[PDB]
Amino acid sequence: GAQVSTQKTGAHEIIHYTNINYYKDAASNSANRQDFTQDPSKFTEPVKDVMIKSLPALN
Amino acid sequence: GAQVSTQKTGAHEIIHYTNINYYKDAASNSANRQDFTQDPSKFTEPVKDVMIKSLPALN
Amino acid sequence: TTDQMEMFRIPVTINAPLQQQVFGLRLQPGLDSVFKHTLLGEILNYYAHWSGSMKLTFVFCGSAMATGKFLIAYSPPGANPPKTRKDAMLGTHIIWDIGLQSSCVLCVPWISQTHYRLVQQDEYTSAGYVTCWYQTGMIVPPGTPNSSSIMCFASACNDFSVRMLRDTPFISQDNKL
Amino acid sequence: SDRVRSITLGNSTITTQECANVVVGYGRWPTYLRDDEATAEDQPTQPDVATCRFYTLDSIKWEKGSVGWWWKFPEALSDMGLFGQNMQYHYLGRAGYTIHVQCNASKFHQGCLLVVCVPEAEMGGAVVGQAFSATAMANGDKAYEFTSATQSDQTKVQTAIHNAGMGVGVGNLTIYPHQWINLRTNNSATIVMPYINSVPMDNMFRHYNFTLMVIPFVKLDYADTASTYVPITVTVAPMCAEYNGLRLAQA
Amino acid sequence: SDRVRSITLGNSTITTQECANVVVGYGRWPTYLRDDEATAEDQPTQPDVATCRFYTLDSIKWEKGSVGWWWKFPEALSDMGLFGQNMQYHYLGRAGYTIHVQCNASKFHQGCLLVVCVPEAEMGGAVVGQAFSATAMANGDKAYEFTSATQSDQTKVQTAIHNAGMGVGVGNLTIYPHQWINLRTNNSATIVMPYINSVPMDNMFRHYNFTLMVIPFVKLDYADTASTYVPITVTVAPMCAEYNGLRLAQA
Amino acid sequence: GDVEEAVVHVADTMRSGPSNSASVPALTAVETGHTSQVTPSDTMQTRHVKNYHSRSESTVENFLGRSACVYMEEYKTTDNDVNKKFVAWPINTKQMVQMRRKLEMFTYLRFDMEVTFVITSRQDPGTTLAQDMPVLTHQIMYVPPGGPIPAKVDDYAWQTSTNPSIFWTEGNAPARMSIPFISIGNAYSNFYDGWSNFDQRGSYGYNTLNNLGHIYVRHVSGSSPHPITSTIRVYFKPKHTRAWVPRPPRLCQYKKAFSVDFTPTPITDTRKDINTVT
Amino acid sequence: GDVEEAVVHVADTMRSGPSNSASVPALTAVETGHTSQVTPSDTMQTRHVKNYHSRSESTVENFLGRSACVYMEEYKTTDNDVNKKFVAWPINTKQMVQMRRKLEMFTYLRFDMEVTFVITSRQDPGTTLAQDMPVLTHQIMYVPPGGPIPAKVDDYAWQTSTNPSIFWTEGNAPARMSIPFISIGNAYSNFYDGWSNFDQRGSYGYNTLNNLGHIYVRHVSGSSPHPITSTIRVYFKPKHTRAWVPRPPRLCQYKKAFSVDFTPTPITDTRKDINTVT
């Protein structure tokens, strides 16, 4: 029950680490700071009708 | 001789932990607080003849 | 109450002014004095959060020849508790008819804005009120007592639950026993 | 046993332990208006558990000298819960009703009551050729009392009990949907009245759909008891109610 | 042409001929509460066309010296149609809103307005460490005016426009859902705000879901015309409204 | 087999509509001693709700699985009174009120025990306090029933050869260990409605069944020029627990450590009248 | 299965050449409330660039994943005033300005908590300082809402049987633990635009929703001949975090711990004129 995953590194320079949980409560686990998904559409494009950048904004 | 089992978590949010026993006496093990079986019939329905909720209690 | 046992009996009489209140209480199972020391309040007092529905069962302990009808209503939280039967009827209620079956059950539904409520209830987590009113009145034949009594039973449904184990405040000591 | 009935509408429940069967109008259960019978064009509102619920009207006293009482609907419920608000704010309405009457007494009492719903119970004034206002026959949920003698005041309806204020024999009211409350074997009566009218919908402030009458055919009697009167209570619950034509609220 | 939009809710319709696009909250359309997220046990009422309809609030005057206005909901609609009655008679509520603001002027006028909905717009009092009643920030549908100078009266909220009564830069309100009314190319703004809260339902008399603010960033100006002011009107329409916990009506 | 792989939720509401029939779930009879199983769906219209709440925290294992103080006591490193330089405590769980009430909610219990000891020291006030003393050490001794009992700090009995003991030095973590189920019977009994002699005479109550032993504590060899006082706290933590025959929680305040004696108490508090709700 | 195996980069510039057409990406209309998505490639000639920068450090988890002080407090081992010998802090995150502002950038939050306690002691000045005292010990007690509250250092409530507690000795590592999501609602709320009573009266603001409990600290049994003062610092570290509805950062200085009250402040600093750039 050991999880092996890559660790942060650079662009062109064994980049693996092992983790095991010792407690029965999920609140005792370490921070899951390895998620990098994001989507700014909710705040940048809240309009109803999709607008194309190339075409005029209105008409 | 390592036991892998799930740990407590929420409804819609690796939820695994490992345990090993180091002592030869079962009294030294950790609390087994992961059992959630219950049956209130012994105290709520101690009658001999089964009574249906829908039908009248008597006659 | 000079006699402690009198606390368990709700008085009733014949020739009752029409549409009178029988009793009224606040729904705080863990804080109100009525539910404080009950078999349920004692359990809740060891916790901080609670949720689920409750059951109130009323049993008529009058004469066999006596008869009557009662209205029992539950009023969700509001700015004012009901003061008349017309106000009370608007909320959840059940019409109780006294007959061969001497007991009726009022199931209090779980209506709340939060998944849980504090045992040390406050204005934010208020729960409402429960009241009982005369529906038709009690009628008895000749040669029977002019008064009767009613008893109430409290328990939890199958969807009840508690959380956050705390230490109860009902028991304390000043010196080592 | 078939002598116990329970009725559940909305967030209210009615339980009776000594009741007769249930009378269902003319054999027709209440239902919503069909598409091929409607005339209004806009979508109808359908407040469900909010309007469809039991509403207990004020209770009355039954003495040895009582003659009877009547109520007119929906003017009786015109100021009751959200039902009254919906009536006030809407031009058209439509709903069936379930009527429950409670009356209990010991085994040593005797008496009989007739419970009947009279659709289109038009009434004539005490003095023939003199009009009456809309107050001698409906003033909210309060009950109006019949009279044993002939009415003489010109400002109110003819309350002759034996004529029932309709110029017909009181004993012939059995034709309408009805039930009897006999203290020997019954405490309550239940009637389910569907929507009856010549049009799919109508204004509930201008038109009285039907009238409820309670007449003691056998006068109450008792001896050597501390109970001096037998209260009577009436409960009503609209069914399958829908409205149309929203507008400013009628004063 | 995409500059013309029509909106139809219930028995009311809104038509605009010079409008920008429509902003939809945080990209989430209003919807009914799901079964797996509900907590209350009893059936919810769902008045549909009765509560879900456009309701026009009182109109305001825009002068050269205006500073801005704000409204708090649903206290603004607390006394409007059947929506107010349903709020009064129920303990819990839930509904999304559609906000439409109208402002039209000739091609020779200049000015710009910011329309923004601020959820949980908690405000601080004029004198730090002194409470205010529930009247300096909401008294029905009437609009409350910001102030250019610092507020001094202790019985009302701090109305400093540049701080917006929240201790934050007024220019950073762009983060919330918003729209601009530029007299050059726009007359109206439309915003669709879903239900946002930390609980599935809440009382609509105790909690202000969100606040609507209108701030003129570019002050109105004109020359040699008979029009002295530019009225502004606000229209709101609840969407997918449902209630629960019926009780006596809150005074 | 280097690895060996080893969600209960409260009931869900179901949708209910209008009903009109002879069935009367609301009506019952408490005379049978049977608690009604009615649900809100049986007396009013309800929506479908999926409830994810769980009763995990209400299990007896978690309820009793908390360490609680059961005994305190003070002993001095040096003093004229011999009996004041060490402690001798007969083991019992009736000394502290909170744990006593928590345990007394059940008639019979069966569990393992986890004991933790917290020891602190302080230097006694005086006219001359200047001194230098290395770290102190303490010995905890357990004497099962019938074994020899020391009579002084430097008695021969402190040479335990079979009696378990722990030596602990200040500044480290508190001492800890485990104790199995050591009852002669099949389960511990919090109450005993009986006597000691066969002719119904002698000791009465749970005092007759308390034969767990004693605990002794002393300073190993510390003897300061000036007095130093130390305090020890004992904490019990049931594990792998089982309970039978629940009983109502106590209402009256405790007054004796080995008896149920009490003073009559009102059932609950009062209010203006039966209708007061404000 | 003894093992179970478990690189996002910012956008890259693309080569752009001369253009002459009717398309006008540079022209838009802010009136729609829509932020333009134009890129430098759309308004000038650009080369092809591969960018390896990542936004890993900008995630909310990392932004809020730092321990910050939230409360300090001092208590003496011995003194005449009973209330001065222990601490009683109602839990709240509005006491320290930095963490308050960091948290207040979002309207709703949901996270686990990691609490660390730092305790230090110092001997009070006086005319006579010579004394010898062993290592001190401290107890940290947490009382959920509605539980009993101690009124003195040696009160009975310090015998916690259900309330969690920690005993710590000076010289070791700071105490640490985890706390789950303990809100009655579905998420913590930093702001609450509402009242407590249903008639719009009573408490106003986020003070109505603060029902987290209290924390108590004391010296276990230390009582020196001369006063000794100790200080405790509490550090909070959100974990497994989620946020909703971002709001602009605060501009005015804080003035109350349970209110949004403020004083009007200028938007920003000034300069000689609109053209000054030096």
Ligand SMILES: CN1CCN(Cc2ccc(NCc3ccc(F)cc3)cc2)CC1
């Ligand atoms: C009559 N009472 C019944 C309940 N029983 C509770 C109880 C159970 C076990 C212990 N163990 C104390 C102990 C003994 C030796 C040791 F090394 C560690 C702990 C105490 C009480 C008390 C009697």
Ligand SMILES: CN1CCN(Cc2ccc(NCc3ccc(F)cc3)cc2)CC1
């Ligand atoms: C109304 N405010 C909303 C934000 N909320 C932040 C917050 C969340 C959790 C805690 N936990 C304190 C704590 C309690 C017990 C324990 F053992 C450890 C830590 C505090 C603040 C504050 C209220």
Ligand SMILES: CCCCCCCCCCCCCC(=O)O
């Ligand atoms: C309480 C857990 C203690 C774990 C001690 C270190 C791991 C020992 C076992 C070797 C790793 C294998 C774990 C696994 O089977 O997933």
Ligand SMILES: CCCCCCCCCCCCCC(=O)O
């Ligand atoms: C006294 C036991 C010490 C155990 C030390 C950690 C475990 C080392 C072995 C790796 C885990 C495999 C155990 C197993 O075979 O079940």
